[PDB]
């Protein structure tokens, strides 16, 4: 199960 | 025995040959179970092990939506780093990203991971306390400050210590036949004359699982680490692993050498001697 | 740019036995960046039905891949793995040896 929050560098 | 779950993501820019290439893979211990490739036709997360194959459509749809979303974040990230290092738009660059969780013999959280690399070198990493960050340079300090203000570490910690571990255990149970299997190595030695007064003794370990193993040679019970040729542990292609160790012996001294094997699937460590 | 040279191992899935089906593997690892050309050869000629695992990497960020094909070993036939990468001036060729 992959994480569902997507931060940016 | 201890277990782990890991996600590995690779993004590669191709200046002027369309958008960047993005490849995602997921593993449970040493068994791969899913993949995503931006160049493929499906455009979906896909099964790579038989045990995950009957998760229903809601699982597949959710994993596909999440992996697409990660793809797009990496498309923006490649431009951002290009600005942070003031690089041209003509070179090809690589971004890598990993995250995971380890659980112990009791299946309890032991450790969590999350880190990035740019063109093969460490860029930013979450520390073991799951509250601090390690920034490799000036560009990475800028990312760190951003992530600190937005409280990104708190969000990662709830996934790594919670969700990650829950799904790892669920996978361990559902794929038990494959994943909770312990396969002891099949061992044997070969002997081959290289000259009239020397010979090569090779010690083999085959069809074992999981990958971790210790394989060494001794002369009269003493360590021979600098005179042993050790190959890297490798995949057989069928879910099992292989490894060998060799030493060049003076003819007449075969009996002084012992090959030592250690692995989870063995009741007691093994000691072999050509004779 | 960082650049790391691929380690190459050419081998079979099961211990070779003349006349019995098996799979010939070429495992490439420890390399960077990710573009690489990998071919399997039968008596000098490039085999066409070759598959590979999905790109992945180790904790030190270096890459690894598995290339493989179905084959039936014979006393006479010779096999090899040929690899090309930015770190190599010429294509590196490693011959299959049944005790390796």
Residues of chain B with CATH 2.60.40.10: 182-270
Give A9→chain B minimum CA distance, Å: 5
What does the radius of gyration of chain C's CA atoms come to, in whole angstroms? Answer: 14
- Under DSSP, the state recorded for C52 is E
The SS3 assignment for C63 reads strand
User: Considering the domain C1-100, what is its CATH architecture?
Assistant: Sandwich (2.60)
Nearest 5°: the CA angle B17, B20, B24 is: 140
Domain B182-270 has CATH 3.40.640.10: no
Residue B265 main-chain phi, psi, to 5 deg: -75, 5
Q: Say whether A8 and B76 touch across the interface (CB within 8 A).
A: yes
Cα separation, C40 vs C47, in Å, equals 6
Size of interface A-B (CB pairs under 8 A): 39
| DSSP per-residue string spanning B55-108 | S-HHHHHHHHHHHHHHHHHHHHHHHHHHHHTT--SSS--EEEEEEEEEE-TTS-
Question: Do the two chains C and A touch, given a threshold of 8 Å on CB pairs and at least 3 pairs?
Answer: no
* B34: its two tokens: 């899913």
**Alpha carbon of residue B194 to chain centroid:** 37
Please tell me the CATH code under which domain B1-181 is placed: 3.30.500.10
Residues of chain B with CATH 3.30.500.10: 1-181
Cα separation, C31 vs B253, in Å, equals 39
At a CB cut-off of 8 Å and minimum separation 6, what does C71 contact? C12, C21, C22, C23, C24, C42, C79
List of chain C residues whose C-beta atoms are within 8 Å of the C-beta of residue B192: 99
Among chain A residues, CA nearest to B171: A1
- Under DSSP, the state recorded for B41 is S
Q: Say whether C2 and B10 touch across the interface (CB within 8 A).
A: no
Residue B54 main-chain phi, psi, to 5 deg: -100, 20
Give B34→chain A minimum CA distance, Å: 10
């Amino acid at each position: 199960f992959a994480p569902g929050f997507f931060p940016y560098l | 025995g201890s277990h782990s779950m890991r996600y590995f993501f690779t993004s590669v820019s191709r200046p002027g040959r369309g958008e960047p290439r993005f490849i995602a893979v997921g593993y449970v211990d040493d068994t791969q179970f899913v993949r995503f490739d931006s160049d493929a036709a499906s455009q979906r997360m896909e099964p790579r092990a038989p045990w995950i194959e009957q998760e229903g459509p809601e699982y597949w749809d959710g994993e596909t939506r999440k992996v697409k979303a990660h793809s797009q974040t990496h498309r923006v990230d490649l431009g951002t780093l290009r600005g942070y290092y003031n690089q041209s738009e003509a070179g090809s660059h690589t971004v890598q990203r990993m995250y995971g969780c380890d659980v112990g013999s009791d299946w309890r959280f032991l450790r969590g991971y999350h880190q990035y690399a740019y063109d093969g070198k460490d860029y930013i990493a979450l520390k073991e306390d799951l509250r601090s960050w390690t920034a490799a340079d000036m560009a990475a300090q800028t990312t760190k400050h951003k992530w600190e203000a937005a409280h990104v570490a708190e969000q990662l910690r709830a996934y790594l210590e919670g969700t990650c571990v829950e799904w790892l255990r669920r996978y361990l149970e559902n794929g038990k036949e494959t994943l909770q299997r312990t396969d002891a190595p099949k061992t044997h030695m070969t002997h081959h004359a290289v000259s009239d007064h020397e010979a090569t003794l090779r010690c083999w370990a085959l069809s074992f699982y999981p990958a971790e193993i210790t394989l060494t040679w001794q002369r009269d019970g003493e360590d021979q680490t600098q005179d042993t040729e050790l190959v890297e542990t490798r995949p057989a292609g069928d879910g099992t692993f292989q490894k060998w160790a060799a030493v060049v012996v003076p003819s007449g001294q075969e009996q002084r050498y012992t090959c030592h094997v250690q692995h989870e699937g063995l009741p007691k460590p093994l000691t072999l001697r050509w004779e | 740019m960082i650049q790391r040279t691929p380690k190459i191992q050419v081998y079979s899935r099961h211990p070779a036995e003349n006349g019995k089906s098996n799979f010939l593997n070429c495992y490439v690892s420890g390399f960077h960046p990710s573009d690489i050309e990998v071919d399997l050869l039968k008596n000098g000629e490039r085999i066409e039905k070759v598959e590979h695992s999905d790109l992945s990497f180790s904790k030190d960020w270096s890459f690894y891949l598995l290339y493989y094909t179905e084959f039936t070993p014979t006393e006479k036939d010779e096999y090899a793995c040929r690899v090309n990468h930015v770190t190599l001036s010429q294509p590196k060729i490693v011959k299959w040896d049944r005790d390796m």
